[PDB]
From a paper:
Here, we describe the crystal structure of BdcA at 2.05 Å, where we show that BdcA is a member of the short-chain dehydrogenase/reductase family. The SDR active site consists of a conserved catalytic triad (Ser-Tyr-Lys), which is C-terminal to the cofactor binding motif, Gly-X3-Gly-X-Gly. In contrast, NADP(H)-specific enzymes contain a basic residue within the glycine-rich motif immediately preceding the second conserved glycine, and/or in the loop after the second β-strand. These residue(s) are responsible for binding the 2′-phosphate. Furthermore, using isothermal titration calorimetry (ITC) and thermal stabilization assays, we identified the biologically relevant cofactor of BdcA to be NADPH. Previously, BdcA was hypothesized to suppress biofilm formation by binding and quenching the secondary messenger c-di-GMP. However, we were unable to show binding of c-di-GMP to BdcA using both DSF and ITC, excluding the possibility of a direct interaction. Furthermore, BdcA does not contain any of the well-known c-di-GMP binding motifs present in other proteins (GGDEF, EAL, HD-GYP). Thus, our data suggests that BdcA most likely influences biofilm dispersal by regulating a process that affects a c-di-GMP related pathway. Furthermore, because of its demonstrated role in biofilm dispersal, BdcA also represents an attractive target for dismantling biofilms.
The gene bdcA (also referred to as yjgI) was previously identified as a regulator of biofilm dispersal. BdcA expression decreases extracellular polysaccharide (EPS) production, cell length and aggregation while simultaneously increasing extracellular DNA production and motility. The structure of BdcA reveals that it is a member of the short-chain dehydrogenase/reductase family of enzymes. Using two complementary binding assays, we show that BdcA binds specifically to NADPH, and thus is highly likely its endogenous cofactor.
Residue numbers in the entry:
A (entry chain A): 2 to 85, 95 to 133, 143 to 178, 204 to 231
B (entry chain B): 0 to 84, 91 to 134, 142 to 176, 207 to 231
The structure:
Amino acid sequence: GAFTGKTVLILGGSRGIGAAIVRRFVTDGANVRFTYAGSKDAAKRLAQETGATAVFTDSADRDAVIDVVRKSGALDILVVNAGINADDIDRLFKINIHAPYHASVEAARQMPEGGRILIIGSVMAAYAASKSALQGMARGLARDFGPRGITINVVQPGPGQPEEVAGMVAWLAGPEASFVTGAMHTI
Amino acid sequence: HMGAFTGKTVLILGGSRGIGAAIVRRFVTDGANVRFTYAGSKDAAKRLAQETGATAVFTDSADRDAVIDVVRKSGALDILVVNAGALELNADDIDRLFKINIHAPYHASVEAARQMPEGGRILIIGSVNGMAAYAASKSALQGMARGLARDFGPRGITINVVQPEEVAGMVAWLAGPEASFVTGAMHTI
């Protein structure tokens, strides 16, 4: 496969876009581990189908996110899938902004040069702030970890779709996108 | 004396130091009833309050509930000013940064909009210039201003971001009569 021998970690990979990304990297011969929270049964079936390793992790819980990344050693590719009241808004910010930041920083300091960090945006006005934040974060991270030979890209899906997003993710993780970083890609 | 904002109530989140203090002075000069929140020195906040004749109240901008509460306690305010803003940062301080620069401006603006009359003015002050956390926060504010303007538009409430006395002047102008149609934009000084 195109990613044979590569170590991949996918946060929030049990369902939808996340699951498609898991399937894509496994099909391309990569060693894949992914995380899940509420959907245990979905993660179980995905692990059974692909052979990928599933680990429970609360994406809203910051320390859990940092821990699961840290325990993954020198990963080659990190994928952070955001997924889908004042508490609802704060939850949205933690998944769209906080979790991708902490995971990316933790991963980047463990990655070899050529490492790829990929963030999948979530699918009122907190959304506009979240999307904008990810675009800004992509630019900032690229500046920060560019000298390390690490690329950072955001894939923002529209309001099937998972397979197409996974294709974009795979391309961005590949050799043809080595000079593409600090970007948000709308698909 | 009376001025441009006589009879108007202004709430300034984080107006104890720097740009915040300048904005406090400017609105008092323009005759407004000014209240501001402080996070650090009680002595400095009390000093500024007595010097300017403004109200000072403690509030940690990182605390969502405290931010929402202090806005609610302000009643039917006319102008809201949210003043946002090391070798290595720990995870908690990063989350604090995001809460101060992203969470607080959102919740404060949303809560203030529920209390404002037509013509109400919301003004967010950006951080003074690892870059990633800063870049994300600045971009977030720009996207937030546009998104909230659509929600606040039919209410007659405008919202703008001022990204850094020059700031205080731009703040007072955006809060003035001429900028009644100006909303949802980020303005660099």
